[PDB]
Design a protein around this ligand. Structure first.
Ligand SMILES: O=P(O)(O)c1ccc(Nc2c(-c3ccccc3)nc3ccccn23)cc1
Length: 441
């Protein structure tokens, strides 16, 4: 397949639903390359667990942890890392309040080349155990020969765009990785990078990041079709920020407007949001503890009850993962009958202004609080007008280079009248979960 989009392994499901899924130990195995060094961009790290995921023969190779922790949290991460002299740390600057470093990415330097992994899992055991998570695996990028002058650039501009993303950190450890990337040929890359970095972007930088980056790519590299107003937008996420007192403040104004863009010419578009209900969490493989990875607070939720009328249950029979709670985030543009999609994005970005950006200064400036990263699959980058949707995620299609593996069921199913969104800081004591327990925060 050309897409190289994988789910993580889920413990406990039938083997047929893990055939072609990847565990972290698979990604780091010597079969993927002879490791020289690596960078692990993430939010949360269990360092002892992380080192054990590397092959024994690679556990002393240099590792850079790129994180956003401050104050006592930074001290704790440093203390986790101090027993391993091969581990260095980069604290990503977060100079706007309430910002986070959420990007999940591995840079893997090998004797044979370079690989980039952009994915959705924290580097802790629980995120790779029984959750639905997404992975994009780059090709093995070969080194450009000493003395050869070539760009190594792809038609999607991925190499320069990944360097631009890393440049935003202004970090010496990441300039070293920028120089590694310069020395490699990334021209086979068929996805577009969509990043968020903290800042206030105007003018020539407005389109670099967040939802304006998405808009710009959709304007330049997608085509509008007849009855485009009938093609829904689907967003699927594991956390919800404060979106405002009604849908016009952000969600259905600037955010939906960027996501419905197609092509360069100048809304009734249905918007489906997929987010686990309480019942989804209760009956999940993990039970109520899965809700510790579904941060949606009651203080935020009670200020935006209008939002929950957009909410659809998690369902993933197609991948055997209805009970594997989602920590993947995805956004896509299906056709009215959900048989095709115009594009697909897998990203770290949840449904929040901090992640996607909020317009300021009379619509002239996009303000972003966090670091995020995802990859966009556009049909034009594969020589296609649209992607067919794969009927069964792990099955064998007649045209695998069309046929995009959407990991959950379409159409999404609206919450029922008795469903409620998972809210992680109130108790649930009416019905026990799959392990016999209640939820008492
Ligand atoms: O639907 P199928 O293809 O007929 C089918 C496939 C597998 C099984 N049994 C089964 C399971 C399992 C069964 C239920 C739920 C979770 C895991 N795990 C293993 C591992 C090795 C061998 C068998 N295993 C039964 C029927």
């Amino acid at each position: 397949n050309p897409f190289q989009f994988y789910l993580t392994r889920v413990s406990g499901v039938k083997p047929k639903y893990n055939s072609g899924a990847l565990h972290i130990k698979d990604i780091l195995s010597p079969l993927f390359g002879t490791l020289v060094s690596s960078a692990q961009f993430n939010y949360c790290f269990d360092v002892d667990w992380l080192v054990k995921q590397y092959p024994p023969e690679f556990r002393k190779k240099p590792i850079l942890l790129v994180h956003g922790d401050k104050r006592e949290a930074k001290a704790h991460l440093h203390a986790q890392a101090k027993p391993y002299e091969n581990i260095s740390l980069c604290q990503a600057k977060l100079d706007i309040a309430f910002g986070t470093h959420h990007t999940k990415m591995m840079l893997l330097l090998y004797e044979e080349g370079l690989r980039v992994v952009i994915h959705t899992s924290n580097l802790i055991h629980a995120d790779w155990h029984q959750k639905t998570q997404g992975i994009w695996l780059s090709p093995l990028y070969p080194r450009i020969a000493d003395g050869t002058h070539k760009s190594g650039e792809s038609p999607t501009h991925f190499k320069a765009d990944l360097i631009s993303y890393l440049m935003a950190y202004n970090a010496p450890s990441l300039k070293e990785w920028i120089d590694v990337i310069h020395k490699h040929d990334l021209s086979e890359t068929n996805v577009y990078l969509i990043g968020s970095t903290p800042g206030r972007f105007q003018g020539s930088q407005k389109d670099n990041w967040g939802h304006f980056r998405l808009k710009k790519l959709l304007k330049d590299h997608a085509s509008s079709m007849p009855n485009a107003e009938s093609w829904p937008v689907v967003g699927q996420f594991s956390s919800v920020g404060s979106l405002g007192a009604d849908e016009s403040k952000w969600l259905c104004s600037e955010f939906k407007e960027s996501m419905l863009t197609l092509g360069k010419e100048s809304s009734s578009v249905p918007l489906y949001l997929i987010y686990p209900s309480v019942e989804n969490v209760r009956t999940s493989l993990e039970g109520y503890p899965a809700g510790g990875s579904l941060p949606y607070s009651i203080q935020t939720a009670e200020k935006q009850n209008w939002l929950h009328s957009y909410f659809h249950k998690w369902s993933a029979e197609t991948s055997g993962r209805s009970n594997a709670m989602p920590h993947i985030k995805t956004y896509m543009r299906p056709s009215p009958d959900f048989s095709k999609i115009a594009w697909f994005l897998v990203t770290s970005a949840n449904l929040s202004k901090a992640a996607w950006g909020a317009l300021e200064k009379n619509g002239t400036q996009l303000m972003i609080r966090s670091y995020e990263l995802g990859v966009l699959f556009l049909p034009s980058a594969f020589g296609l007008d649209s992607f067919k949707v794969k009927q069964k995620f792990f099955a064998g299609s007649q045209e695998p280079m069309a046929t995009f593996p959407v990991p959950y069921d379409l159409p999404p199913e609206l919450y029922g009248s008795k469903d409620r969104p998972w809210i992680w800081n109130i108790p649930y004591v009416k019905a026990p979960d799959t392990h016999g327990n209640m939820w008492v925060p």
